[PDB]
Amino acid sequence: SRPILELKEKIQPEILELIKQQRLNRLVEGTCFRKLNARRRQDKFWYCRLSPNHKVLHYGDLEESPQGEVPHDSLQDKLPVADIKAVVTGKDCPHMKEKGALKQNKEVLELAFSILYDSNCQLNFIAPDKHEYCIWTDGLNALLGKDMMSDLTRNDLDTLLSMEIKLRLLDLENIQIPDAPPPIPKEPSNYDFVYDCN
Amino acid sequence: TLLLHAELLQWSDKPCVPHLLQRDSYYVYTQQELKEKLYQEIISYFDKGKMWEKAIKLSKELAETYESKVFDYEGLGNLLKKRASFYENIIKAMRPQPEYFAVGYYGQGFPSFLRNKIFIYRGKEYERREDFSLRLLTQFPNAEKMTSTTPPGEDIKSSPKQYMQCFTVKPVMSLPPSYKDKPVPEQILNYYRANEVQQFRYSRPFRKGEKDPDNEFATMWIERTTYTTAYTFPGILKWFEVKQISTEEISPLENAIETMELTNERISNCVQQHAWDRSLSVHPLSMLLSGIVDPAVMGGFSNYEKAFFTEKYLQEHPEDQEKVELLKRLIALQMPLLTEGIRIHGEKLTEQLKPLHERLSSCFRELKEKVEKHYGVITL
Amino acid sequence: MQAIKCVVVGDGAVAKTCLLISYTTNAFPGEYIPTVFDNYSANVMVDGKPVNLGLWDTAGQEDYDRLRPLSYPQTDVFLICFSLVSPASFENVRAKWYPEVRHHCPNTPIILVGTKLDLRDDKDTIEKLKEKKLTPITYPQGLAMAKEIGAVKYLECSALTQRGLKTVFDEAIRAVL
């Protein structure tokens, strides 16, 4: 399968592309995110929609919406990407370094992500579980145009690559691909087509 | 809009054409009855739309039609009671003035209508231009603008990657008909300072002259950015294009004129708003008078003396110096205006204002005699 | 309706009056008109209700400390003002503008603001200050001074460029809100 694997893993471009596209769609659709330590009647649900323009983030101190996102220009409708330095994830989050009343507990370490914008104010966020957290940071890295850091993302990429190479190889069944590609037959150096083109 | 529809209708006694016979409900529907429905809803709108001027302006001929055809005497009376309600709302209730913006969407990236044309926008009553441009960034992709606030962005006249440009333009005054001769109370003006507005302008401070440090005044020029809106503000659409834009210019004399004019108009403004008011803080009086008594940051008294009143500016302008005498007139009516300021201060004068009013009387009569001699005014 | 009195206190060597009138001008950056008046006041909402906002311009002159202790009583808030790249402004505030205001009224919300933040990181002005052996006041310096006095909020915005300026005044208005 060595030539087959060469052929397969050489034509990547579109697979990670589509996975990142899906991540982007996930951020655009968005859902109710969690604030910090939503305890004293604080909204553990509030939405953050990536723009239809993909230029603003519809994040705002919205209420406990079990449905999910409510569509409007949120309490903080703007989050341009031109200034998004990064997102601190895990212990790197300032909300994970808080030792005051907002001290995030030990059950939010993987729910730790705060978008770096303005270099001082971080969208100190908490996730409902690991997978959507990884997807959020994935899509944000897609806004940064970098790699996807969900384990399930690499799952999707490998399985799509395997299925795709599976769904191409049909015709060369009963035939082999030499590791060195079979010799290109010497074309007639004259471009002369005795019968017309097409 | 509903009116525009009713505008098509006539008070005729009959159901005339079924085209206007709407599909929400349908029976005989004689024209005057339809206008009656429409006018009911229109007046309801205006009542909840706060535009009771329109409410009354229609209710008049509404009752006219009542009596003239139908004798809806019950409707006559209730309609007129509502008219009374509207008038009371007018005199009593006060209304805020929305900030106004002539908006240039620049970029071939905008649609054909959305590109390179100055759309005058009726914002909200108290809009900050920054939040306005913010929602434009919400409005459009490519959240970036021109710092070319005054001039157009020619590159982004035909470039993609839409740019923008905005600012709070001047709401040009309304024209209260037959009220200019009339000492009308304020309610008409407050209702007119930001509504029924089609002309607009934004400020263009400019430095055309000798930019010496103390004087900003022989250089200060305002290239007023005159606008005409195609349609009334308010109107069928909040925003609108500029129907016609015009730049302007303002000479060092004319800009001295306007500085002292805004000075005096704000003096008169605070004085008069205090005059008919009684539940007013005297802090603004302290503001005005404490600022006036000291031509402090720069001696605007002395600044105008040097810039225009003195001989050097006769050197700049011998023939057309008959406006620095007009600056003398401006101050010479300012200090009687400052005198009504003194009056309102004194009638609302307190213990900590007492040293303040001491300085008021003292230095103010000082500037009085000073303009009578040094500034060369011929007072009243 | 509400009217807030605020005695702005800080040195005139930084020319905060430019910033204040520019905001009152609400100007496009660099397009404001400074005036001859003092104590520029206006009326802008932040939320729910506009406020008759009064920004008393007490210039940097220390002599006016004869009647600025009349401005301190019965004043809703105060704007204590310094420049981050004018160290003399820093020390003058902590020596005159901070203490005199603090002690004339040890009970009033107080907001320390760092002027010329645009020049706090200005390589040319900073290298001048180092050549002039002047320390560019960084964010931690003002942070420490704030937690020293417990100013209701310490800030640093821009005058020529109006950056954070509108936000700074927004929190200034919401301070009594």
Concatenated DSSP letters for C26-53? Answer: TPSTT-----S-SS-EEEE-SSSS-EEE
The count of domains in chain C is: 1
Greatest Cα pair distance in chain C: 52
Q: How far apart are the C-alpha atoms of C55 and C148, rounded to whole Å?
A: 25
The shortest CB-CB distance from B287 to any of C28, C45, C54 is to: C54
Contact yes or no for C89/C13 (Cβ under 8 A): yes
Residue A182 per-residue DSSP state: P
Chain B contact present for C34, CB below 8 A: yes
Find, in chain B, the residue whose alpha carbon is nearest to that of A50.
B138
Angle, vertex CA B226, rays to CA B223 and CA B232, nearest 5: 160
Question: Cβ–Cβ of A53/B134 closer than 8 Å?
Answer: no
Contact yes or no for B345/B285 (Cβ under 8 A): yes
Q: Across-strand partners of C47?
A: none
Q: How far apart are the C-alpha atoms of B166 and B158, rounded to whole Å?
A: 19
| Tokens found for residue B314 | 């006769």
Chain B contact present for A118, CB below 8 A: no
Method: cryo-EM
Q: Count other C-beta atoms under 10 Å from residue B245's C-beta.
A: 18
Instruction: Please name which of B118, B121, B103, B111 lies closest in space to residue B141, comparing C-alpha atoms.
Output: B111
Contact yes or no for A52/A28 (Cβ under 8 A): yes
Contact yes or no for A23/A133 (Cβ under 8 A): no
User: C-alpha dihedral over C148, C150, C152, C155, to 10 degrees?
Assistant: 10
Find, in chain A, the residue whose alpha carbon is nearest to that of B141.
A53
| Structural domain that includes position C111 | 1-177
The structure tokens 């940064």 sit at A144
R_g of chain A computed on alpha carbons: 24
Chain B contact present for A55, CB below 8 A: yes
Instruction: Please name which of B351, B217, B337 lies closest in space to residue B289, comparing C-alpha atoms.
Output: B337
Dihedral-angle region of residue C69 (phi above 0 means left; psi in -120 to 50 means alpha; beta otherwise): alpha
Find, in chain C, the residue whose alpha carbon is nearest to that of B296.
C36
Q: How many CA atoms, within 13 angstroms, populate the side-chain half-sphere of residue C115?
A: 25
Instruction: Please name which of B272, B267, B85, B246 lies closest in space to residue B169, comparing C-alpha atoms.
Output: B246
Question: Residue B46 — φ and ψ, nearest 5°?
Answer: -65, -35
All residues of chain B having their beta carbon less than 8 Å from the beta carbon of residue C45 are 126
All residues of chain B having their beta carbon less than 8 Å from the beta carbon of residue A77 are 134, 138
| Tokens found for residue B118 | 């100055």
Give resolution, Å, one decimal: 4.5
B310 CB-near residues (< 8 Å, 6+ apart): none
The structure tokens 């301070």 sit at C175
Q: Across-strand partners of A143?
A: none
Q: How far apart are the C-alpha atoms of A36 and B159, rounded to whole Å?
A: 44
> Please, what is the angle between helix B324-347 and helix B353-373, to 10°?
150
Q: How far apart are the C-alpha atoms of B301 and A180, rounded to whole Å?
A: 93
Which amino acid is located at A77 in the chain? D
Question: Cβ–Cβ of B137/A73 closer than 8 Å?
Answer: no
Cα distances from A153 to residues A110, A143, A162, B319, in angstroms, run 16, 16, 14, 82
For residue A89, give the H/E element and its range: strand A86-89
Q: How far apart are the C-alpha atoms of B139 and B131, rounded to whole Å?
A: 12
Q: How far apart are the C-alpha atoms of A85 and A92, rounded to whole Å?
A: 14
Question: Residue B176 — φ and ψ, nearest 5°?
Answer: -70, 110
First to last CA, chain A: 35
Residue A38 per-residue DSSP state: -
Chain B contact present for A17, CB below 8 A: no
